[PDB]
Design a protein around this ligand. Structure first.
Ligand SMILES: [Zn+2]
Ligand SMILES: [Zn+2]
Ligand SMILES: [Zn+2]
Ligand SMILES: [Zn+2]
Lengths: 32, 221, 103, 108, 394, 122, 16, 268, 320, 29, 348, 36
């Protein structure tokens, strides 16, 4: 994500953070 | 019409939270005397200009100067709107109000070229008129800004001389009820002080006083 | 009790202090000259209110609309006690016909 | 003349007989010439000569309510607290706009 | 004592002498040593007994004016004296006018006397016009201020009242920054809203000196005749035209007096492209500046704009001179690298139809409609000019 | 209170708390302590190349400044704690631009050597 | 174009 | 009861207002904005005095993206999901103004997929029984003449530009990969009425924003205010324009009381 | 009260309030000094193998209390909230106990806490003359230091008006005076510590000696900087103005927020019930009795349970 | 705008009018 | 992650002084607090090297604020005019802070002087507008007066008068000081005679002289008749020359530079006289110094009554609004109401 | 009446009239449930 081409680096890096810690948490169940 | 609610965010405090943050405090403001009946520049907000108020010439003085004029008592009309003037005050010269702050900056020759009459001397008597005496009062303040020793104002000039019912149409700029004012939209102050300035005690048509400090009355109880 | 209810229905309302446009305080003198009370106003039937509003009171259609929530709920005109000696608190509870519309 | 030291029953009788509209506007501007002690005494004298003390006069006063309310208004004031052509031009083009837009329809 | 003259390329004529006001004069530089004892005397404070016996308004204005800016704002906010706001505009350390507007609104916020908020937080339009005219003088000095001025306007229209005074001051702000198109478009929006252009902003726009704080103070006593002339010219132009033509005339005179001739011709370009009907005084002034400059600083679309405005309202000789100078500058060896002015078919038909409409009533247009049609269609035989000279001599 | 509304001493007056030391009277440190606290030697701007860098030099007190991303955030508060030649403000600098290469050879020199290099060399 | 109820200039003009 | 404003950012976000201001004297897909603003303004401090809110005004923001033919750098490295040919992904940001402070109500991501899901297989084998019935009663509104309170700089440049970009997407979505589900998507993206509010409530509705992380709450506000351009200046303008156009509609209401009362008196 | 500007002088409601509150006088009677009559002696409240707490109740007409902690080993004493109308009994007590006064702890800088502070420091330093006494305080109370004179204006404390407060003098945290080369009683006070608002259970303590640690807790709401003392080995919580017997502190004074007071009451729930809470005013209680029988904490936790995001609690009539 | 019709012939004639309207508005490259 | 209301996830301690160590923080720990992870698209970083030490400066201004934040809170300068003025606006705010603490609180006890004031509520007369001096300053005051009473009682405004009182009172405040940083703030309160402003006037004077030599170089080289002190006219002459040749759109009309050569020479003569009395060297005075002593004594007498005349003006408004309403009363008039007193047809 | 300009019954009436909104507005009905 180059800042010259992508001005939304505060959101795209924050949402890439929020993908991982919603999957890396162990409190969630995979099965319904 | 039809009692438009206004888009200001003033509000009275509730019945649940305590009264806090007393480095700003609104209270109701009631002065001693009514000033709404008075002349516009004799009211409360123009008291500091009280020594700047021109001396009043009256109706009988104006009729005496109509009958028996003096060579250096200059009667000067300060009305601006040409569509609202229908008669001529005798011995009067037209110097409209909105040009006065430029007109007194000229020399005598430039005054004669730009107005067609000679510039009055600073010791000559100058007498100003308007519809209500409002444009003539501002023009008298502009004439007293320059060093003119004798400046007089006929309050209610044309409306008492010719018996007309006109006005100078002063706006007295009041915000439209869609215009949201400054302290609602802004981070100029902290949130406690912003919440405590925007509060008021009672309806928002009257006047209020803002206290910058308060101490608790420990001697009551 | 009739005076304070008509005073509150004409004053400012709410946290934003919305002024009530219709002044119901002008009809207070003609209501007490007839000898009718706020508790006696709740005892009047529907047909006795149309006679009272049109003939005696001359209540307009917007002044009738600002007074009718006070008559629809049958507010009990009882002065509540307060921290001061002069009380301006009327009980705003809805009255019942078994207890004389006193709630 | 000493306007403050005129007899107060004399002023309120002469002011009671003002009914014409042009002289009523004269009394409004003239009543500022009295003092504040005088104009609060004219209200108490006018209210008494039309009220309980109406027997002090030889001939009773006539009911002038527009001068009674204005003297009572003026005494409270002196005491401390305790472009039609261009506007009508704008209205006509708006009704012209609503007929063209269809907000004011014709006969159905 | 021989100083050079700045090249305004303004016409020397008694008609446009009001346009010659705003020109700096070396006569004032010669008059300058006479004023030196006066300004040397004015630097001293009055005595204590005179200042203690002074009236209230005079003492307030002479103490708050000498005081620091934030201390004067504190005194105003403490004693709720809002009428001393034009004094603290003139302070010795006052910031740029957007900061002063924020300080004015802050002083109205924390004031000791709180009116109802529809009248408490409303500044007078004279104050807002003075603030925006200071901003426009700074944009004349430095154009990159304009962005903040836009932000300033983005608050003022949301907080104060949008009057024609502040809108004309914002048009002057956009003009002084070099922004030609949006200034004329704001002027056209005022003209469609039937708002009159302010005459003091129209006079200050054609005076690109004289920051208005010392104009309302009056430290420059001369050139008030020029200010009155420009105000009366603005009133005369508004009697028969809309606000956009008056604003475009002010833009033209401002860009002529600031030696920015490219924006001066961009004014005419944008006024023809937008649809603003220019006043006849502005068209005659543009033709005489074109004559002074010999068509050097000009483009093809500016030539098309001038010919459209001359066919709409203009004499035959002005249009013929503009077309002949354009055709001669096309043939000059200097401008051979630059492209030639070519009329597309629709605008050519429009110009020729307006010329034929003028020529049905005018004989001076009917005698030269064929020469105009030959000059626009780019085929110009010299026999037409020879017959024109023969008819002029005979 | 109303006395603390307009600065000095206001709410958002960020210079009312105190001043910096700006003196060699304490913490005599070496060249490695300057190298570890360089802006240019940090990780987050070593791989940053699209923001613009400006290298300037004062000719009065002889300091070397580098500013990055000033075109996007042009804060006028930047450098307010500069304290030029003899307890003067940072309005007294009169900075002149220098290149990247001659910033590195002048960063290690003391202020008198920088002023002598400016006056008698280049 | 005005019709005033009272006037102070006109009775002084009419005698002259 | 409403007014719609549009804004088209060419070459993506980087041509917005905040990203272009700099200090002087020293590609991507285009974004189409749409702010629907009804006249729904109320104060909740009347019904509940414990709430310190002076004004609550709701207005919806629809942001769509459109790929042009001029971008060469990142054309076919991934399928673009914002394209109307591929999903027609669009973000529906329900916004609000709480005492001239813009607060987000919901952030919904709607495509033609969940419009196809609601019409065909929202139940076990069928669609929603209320969403299918609401599409069975869809009558057009009579054509109202619109008034153009544009930005002054773009007032005289182009007039039919919000109409052209509305028909650019409507052609591209109706002839897209999802063809017969576009009337279900028109009622889904219809911001005026109760049928569109129930249709968007059948979708997810986004996470409840106060439960999100503080880093995501500030980055979403930095995107909408700073990057997307939907600012507090725009938010405060909508509260002003809801007040001004209510005043304009009161005068036409006064013109229609007079027009009705004059037509009766000349008839009786 | 506040500064009499033009708007306050032309207001009739101001004269109406000054007639309603104070009758025909119109001027508020101040808070005077307690005379030598009706004054009690210093009581020894607590005796322990580690420390000794000696206090005096109702030492002001603000009805504040004065406490001193004595280390039994090091013979060092510590005054907390130094406000006594007679700091001559305390200096005689320190001199007859062979104690050394090294620091004075200040919870907050209201006038009911720092009224006789210069008198304490002067008399105890004069007895030490036959190292000076330091002051421990939070810098947010700087905003209440500058209004010490104004508070001395309204409460009639005229003899304490023209006194430079020792917290205003140059400490080691401040720049030094550049005196002429040709004094240190007032120019520099090296014994001065500024407490930080980041208070933790690890390192936010004062080493009183003999292994006794005094943890200061940052708890605003009655003041911008308000520091409680907590001694966990002795189960003693000098609360100051945060918590009293059946009541809490005022919020109707400037720089006082109700939600800060609610957070300050919420940061107190991890202490045991047998912790004797020692307030700045009135009688002392325990934290368990305040968890059971105090209505302000009941309202705070009830508003927290029913879902108030900004719980605001606080008194409007009580102790300053 | 949307207009509702009663037959098939008027729809065809309106569609041909729309064809003539779209071809008289500018002819493609 | 996403948080829930009322449910918090507990996290272990680092066991290093808590979150903020009260004992101290080393250089490598504070290096990470220095280069804290701000978003770099909206962050400006700046460092300056000043010989031995260097100072780091990092500012981040968010994206959700720049439409509503104040121009003073977020001091963004999008032009070089805003850079030079925004720094100079923040110059005086910081300079008054670091100077004002030397004489108020946190000042030396010899550098703190107070004024006593008392104004009568009825007569509006200032009673006892004195200074509060110590015993050292009062010995300087009577050393001043006993010398000047011995010189001015034989010849020549009464017996009980204080000769050059507002000059020695302004010099007694400076005499009793012990810090030079608190001395220069009193020189700024007394007409701005501090060395900060006098070196500012000396810098603008030498800049005008250097510009006077440039206009003299241009007018001699162009032609190859002038006013006397051309350095006052040279900012006005050079502003026209750049406007004339084409580089600049504005010529200047500001005449504030005129008379500044004689003005700044008087200010440094005022300052040299103020230092001459503090060192008690008033036993001989040149005639040029005696004319400056009379002028500066009246100039210093009116600057100490700026605040007292402000409160005097508010006390005018207080007695104004208590006046009797109306046009007046017939008891308290010398003139009939409807005419001027100077009317020839006065008595009907 | 001389010094303060009013009398104590009028003072009590003015004090009761200046703060009429924040004395009593509603009776605050309803029930608050535990949310945790
Ligand atoms: Zn009841
Ligand atoms: Zn420097
Ligand atoms: Zn306290
Ligand atoms: Zn306390």
């Amino acid at each position: 994500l180059p800042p010259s081409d992508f001005p939304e680096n505060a959101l795209l890096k924050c949402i890439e953070k929020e993908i991982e810690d919603e999957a890396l948490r162990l409190d969630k169940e995979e099965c319904p | 019409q039809a009692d438009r609610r206004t888009r200001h965010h003033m509000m009275v405090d509730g019945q649940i939270n305590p009264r806090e943050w007393f480095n700003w405090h609104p209270k109701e403001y009631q002065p001693w005397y009514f000033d709404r009946h008075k002349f516009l520049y004799e009211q409360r907000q123009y008291a500091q200009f009280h020594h700047l108020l021109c001396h009043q010439v009256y109706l009988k003085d104006m009729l005496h100067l109509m009958r028996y004029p003096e060579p250096y008592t200059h009667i000067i009309d300060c009305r601006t709107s040409t569509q609202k003037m229908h008669r001529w005050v005798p011995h009067s010269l037209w110097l409209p109000r909105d040009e006065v702050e430029y007109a007194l900056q000229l020399s005598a020759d430039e005054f004669l070229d730009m107005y067609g009459f000679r510039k009055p001397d600073k010791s000559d008597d100058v007498i100003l008129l308007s519809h209500n005496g409002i444009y003539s009062e501002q023009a008298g303040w502009e004439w007293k800004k320059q060093f003119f020793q004798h400046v007089y104002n006929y309050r209610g000039g044309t409306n008492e001389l010719f018996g007309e019912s006109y006005s100078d149409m002063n706006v007295s700029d009041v915000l439209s009820p869609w215009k949201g004012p400054f302290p609602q939209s802004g981070v100029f102050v902290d949130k406690w002080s912003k919440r405590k300035v925007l509060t008021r005690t009672g309806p928002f048509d009257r006047q209020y006083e803002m206290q910058d400090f308060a101490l608790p009355d420990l001697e009551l109880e | 009790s009739l005076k304070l209810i008509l005073e509150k229905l004409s004053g400012h309302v709410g946290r934003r202090q919305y002024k009530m446009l219709c002044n119901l305080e002008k009809h207070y003198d003609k209501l007490k000259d007839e000898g009718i009370d706020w508790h006696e106003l709740k005892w009047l039937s529907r047909e006795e209110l149309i006679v009272l509003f049109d003939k005696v009171l001359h209540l307009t259609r917007t002044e009738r609309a600002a007074l009718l929530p006070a008559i629809e709920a049958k507010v009990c005109g009882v002065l509540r006690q307060t921290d001061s000696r002069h009380s301006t608190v009327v009980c705003m509870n809805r009255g019942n016909a078994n207890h004389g519309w006193r709630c | 003349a000493d306007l403050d030291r005129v007899e107060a029953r004399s002023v309120v009788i002469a002011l009671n007989a003002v009914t014409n509209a042009d002289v009523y506007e004269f009394v409004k501007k003239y009543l500022f010439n009295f003092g504040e002690r005088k104009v609060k005494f004219l209200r108490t004298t006018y209210s008494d000569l039309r009220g309980h003390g109406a027997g002090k006069l030889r001939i009773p006063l006539k009911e002038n309510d527009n001068m009674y309310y204005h003297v009572c208004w003026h005494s409270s004031i002196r005491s401390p607290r305790q472009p039609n052509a261009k506007i009508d031009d704008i209205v006509k083009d708006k009704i012209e706009k609503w007929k063209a837009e269809g907000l004011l329809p014709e006969d159905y | 004592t021989q100083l050079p003259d700045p090249p305004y390329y303004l016409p020397h004529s008694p008609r446009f002498d009001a346009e010659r006001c705003g020109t700096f004069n070396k006569k004032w530089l010669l008059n300058l040593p006479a004023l030196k004892p006066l300004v040397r005397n004015s630097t001293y404070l009055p005595k204590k007994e005179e200042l203690w016996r002074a009236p209230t308004h005079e003492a307030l204005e002479t103490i708050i004016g000498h005081l620091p800016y934030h201390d004067a704002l504190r005194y105003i906010t403490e004693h709720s004296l809002f009428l001393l706001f034009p004094t603290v505009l003139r302070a010795r350390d006052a910031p740029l006018p957007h900061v002063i507007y924020e300080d004015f609104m802050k002083s109205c916020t924390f004031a000791s006397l709180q009116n109802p908020p529809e009248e408490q937080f409303a500044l007078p339009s004279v104050l807002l016009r003075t603030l925006l005219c200071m901003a426009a003088y700074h944009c004349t000095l430095d154009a990159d201020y304009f962005t903040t001025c836009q932000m300033l306007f983005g608050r003022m229209e949301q907080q104060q009242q949008t009057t024609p005074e502040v809108l004309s001051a914002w048009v002057y702000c956009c003009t002084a920054s070099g922004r030609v198109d949006e200034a004329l478009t704001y002027a056209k929006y005022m003209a469609d809203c039937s708002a009159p252009f302010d005459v003091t902003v129209f006079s200050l726009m054609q005076h690109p000196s004289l920051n208005p704080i010392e104009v309302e103070d009056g430290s420059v006593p001369h050139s008030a005749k020029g200010l009155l002339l420009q105000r009366r010219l603005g009133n005369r132009l508004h009697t028969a035209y809309r606000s956009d033509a008056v604003a475009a005339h002010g833009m033209f005179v401002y860009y002529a007096l600031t030696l920015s001739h490219v924006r001066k011709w961009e004014v005419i370009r944008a006024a023809a492209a937008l649809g603003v009907t220019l006043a006849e005084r502005t068209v005659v002034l543009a033709v005489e500046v074109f004559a002074r400059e010999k068509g050097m600083r000009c483009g093809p679309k500016t030539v098309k704009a001038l010919t459209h405005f001359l066919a709409q309202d203009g004499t035959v000789g002005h249009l013929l001179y503009v077309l002949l100078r354009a055709r001669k500058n096309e043939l000059l060896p200097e401008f051979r690298d630059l492209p030639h002015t070519t009329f597309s078919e629709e605008e050519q038909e429009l110009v020729l139809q307006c010329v034929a409409q003028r020529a049905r009533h005018d004989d001076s247009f009917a005698v030269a409609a064929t020469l105009v049609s030959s000059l626009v269609r780019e085929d110009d035989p010299s026999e037409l000019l020879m017959a024109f000279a023969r008819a002029a001599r005979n | 209170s109303r006395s603390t509304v307009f600065g000095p001493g206001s709410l958002y007056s960020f210079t009312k708390f105190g001043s910096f030391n700006r003196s060699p009277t304490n913490c005599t440190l070496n060249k490695r302590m300057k190298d570890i606290f360089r802006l240019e030697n940090q990780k987050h701007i070593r791989n940053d190349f699209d923001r613009e860098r400006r290298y300037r030099m004062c000719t009065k007190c002889g300091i070397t400044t580098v500013t990055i991303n000033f075109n996007n955030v042009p804060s006028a508060r930047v450098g307010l704690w500069g304290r030029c030649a003899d307890d003067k403000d940072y309005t007294h600098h009169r900075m002149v631009d220098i290149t990247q290469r001659e910033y590195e050879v002048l960063r290690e020199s003391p202020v008198e050597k920088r002023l002598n290099w400016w006056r008698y060399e280049r | 174009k005005s019709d005033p109820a009272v006037d102070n200039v006109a009775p002084l003009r009419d005698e002259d | 009861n409403y007014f719609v404003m549009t804004r088209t950012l060419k070459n993506g976000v980087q041509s917005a207002e905040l990203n272009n201001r700099r200090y002087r004297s020293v590609s991507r897909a285009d974004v189409h904005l749409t702010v629907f603003a009804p006249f729904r303004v109320y104060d909740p401090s009347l019904h509940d005095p414990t709430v310190d809110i002076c004004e609550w005004s709701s207005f919806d923001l629809v942001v769509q993206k459109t790929v042009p033919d001029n971008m060469v750098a990142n054309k076919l490295l991934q399928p673009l999901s914002c394209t109307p040919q591929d999903g027609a992904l669009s973000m529906y940001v329900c916004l609000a103004s709480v005492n001239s402070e813009m607060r987000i109500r919901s952030i919904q991501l709607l495509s033609m997929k969940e419009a196809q899901a609601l019409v065909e297989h929202a139940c076990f084998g069928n669609g929603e029984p209320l969403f299918l019935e609401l599409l069975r009663r869809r009558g057009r509104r009579r054509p109202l003449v619109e008034r153009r309170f544009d930005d002054p700089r773009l007032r005289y440049e182009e007039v039919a530009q919000p109409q052209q970009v509305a028909d650019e997407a409507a052609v591209a979505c109706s002839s897209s990969c999802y063809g017969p589900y576009y009337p279900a998507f028109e009622m889904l993206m219809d911001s005026c009425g109760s049928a569109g509010e129930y249709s968007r409530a059948l979708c997810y509705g986004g996470p409840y924003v106060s439960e999100l992380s503080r880093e995501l709450c500030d980055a979403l506000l930095d995107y909408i205010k700073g990057d997307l351009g939907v600012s507090d200046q725009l938010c405060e303008y909508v509260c002003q324009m809801q007040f001004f156009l209510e005043q304009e509609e009161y005068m036409t209401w006064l013109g229609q009381v007079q027009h009705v009362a004059n037509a009766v008196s000349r008839t009786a | 009260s506040y500064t009499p500007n033009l708007t306050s002088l032309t207001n009739q409601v101001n004269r109406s309030e000054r007639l309603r509150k104070w009758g025909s006088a119109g001027v508020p009677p101040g808070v005077p000094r307690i005379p030598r009559l009706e004054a009690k002696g210093i009581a020894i409240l607590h005796e322990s193998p580690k420390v000794i707490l000696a206090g005096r109740s109702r030492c002001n007409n603000f009805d504040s209390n004065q406490y001193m902690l004595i280390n039994k080993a090091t013979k060092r004493c510590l005054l907390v909230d130094a406000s006594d109308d007679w700091p001559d009994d305390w200096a005689a007590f320190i001199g007859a106990s062979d104690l050394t006064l090294t620091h004075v702890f200040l919870t907050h800088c209201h006038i009911d806490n720092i009224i006789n502070l210069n008198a304490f420091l002067t008399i105890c330093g004069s007895r030490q003359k036959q190292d000076e006494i330091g002051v421990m305080w939070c810098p947010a109370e700087e905003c209440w230091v500058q209004n010490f004179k104004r508070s001395c204006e309204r409460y009639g404390r005229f003899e304490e008006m023209h006194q430079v407060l020792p917290m205003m003098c140059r400490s080691l945290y401040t720049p030094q005076h550049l005196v002429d080369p040709v004094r240190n009683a007032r120019h520099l006070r090296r014994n001065d510590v500024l407490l930080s608002a980041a208070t933790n259970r690890a390192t936010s303590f004062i080493d009183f000696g003999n292994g006794v640690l005094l943890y200061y807790i940052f708890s605003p709401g009655h003041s911008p900087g308000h520091m409680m003392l907590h001694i966990p080995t002795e189960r003693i919580l000098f609360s100051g103005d945060l918590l009293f017997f059946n009541k809490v502190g005022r919020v109707d004074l400037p720089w006082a927020t109700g939600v800060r007071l609610a957070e300050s009451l919420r940061l107190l729930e991890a202490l045991p019930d047998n912790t004797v809470v020692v307030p700045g005013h009135g009688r002392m209680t325990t934290l368990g009795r305040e968890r059971r029988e105090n209505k302000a904490l009941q309202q705070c936790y009830q508003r927290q349970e029913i879902g108030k995001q900004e719980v605001s609690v606080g008194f409007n009539e009580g102790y300053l | 705008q949307q207009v509702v019709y009663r037959s098939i012939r008027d729809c065809r004639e309106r569609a041909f009018h729309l064809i003539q309207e779209l071809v008289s508005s500018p002819g493609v490259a | 992650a996403r948080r829930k209301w009322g449910q918090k996830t507990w996290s272990p301690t680092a066991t290093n002084g808590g979150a903020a160590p009260a004992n101290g923080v080393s250089a490598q720990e504070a290096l990470q607090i220095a280069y804290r992870p701000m978003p770099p698209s909206q962050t400006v970083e700046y460092e300056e090297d000043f010989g031995h030490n260097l100072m780091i400066h990092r500012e981040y201004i968010s994206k959700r604020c720049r439409d509503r934040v104040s121009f003073e809170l977020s001091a963004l300068s999008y032009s070089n005019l805003e850079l030079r003025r925004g720094q100079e606006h923040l110059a005086g705010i910081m300079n008054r802070e670091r100077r004002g603490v030397s004489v108020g609180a946190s000042g030396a006890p010899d550098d703190q002087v107070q004024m006593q004031t008392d104004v009568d509520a009825n007569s509006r007369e200032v009673l006892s507008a004195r200074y509060l001096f110590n015993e050292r300053r009062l010995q300087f005051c009577d050393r001043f007066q006993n010398f000047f009473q011995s010189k001015l009682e034989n010849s020549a405004n009464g017996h009980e008068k204080q000769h050059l009182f507002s000059l020695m009172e302004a010099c007694a405040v400076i005499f009793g000081c012990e810090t030079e940083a608190a001395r220069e703030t009193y020189y700024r309160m007394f007409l701005g005679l501090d060395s900060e402003t006098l070196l500012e006037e000396d810098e603008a004077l030498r800049n005008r002289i250097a510009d006077a030599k440039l206009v003299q170089r241009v007018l001699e080289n162009n032609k190859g008749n002038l006013p006397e002190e051309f350095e006052e006219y040279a900012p006005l002459y050079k502003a026209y020359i750049t406007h004339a040749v084409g580089k600049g759109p504005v010529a200047s009309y500001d005449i504030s530079t005129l008379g500044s050569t004689g003005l700044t020479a008087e200010r440094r003569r005022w300052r040299t006289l103020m230092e001459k009395i503090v060192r008690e060297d008033y036993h001989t005075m040149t005639e040029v110094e005696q004319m400056d002593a009379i002028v500066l004594n009246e100039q210093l007498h009116t600057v100490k009554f700026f605040d007292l005349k402000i409160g005097d003006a508010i006390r005018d408004i207080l007695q104004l609004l208590q006046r009797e309403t109306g046009v007046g009363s017939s008891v308290n008039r010398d003139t009939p109401v409807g005419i001027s007193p100077n009317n020839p047809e006065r008595r009907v | 009446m001389t010094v303060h300009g009013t009398s104590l019954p009028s003072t009590y009436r003015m004090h009761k009239d200046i703060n009429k909104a924040q004395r009593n507005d509603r009776k605050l009905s309803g029930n608050r449930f535990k949310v945790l």
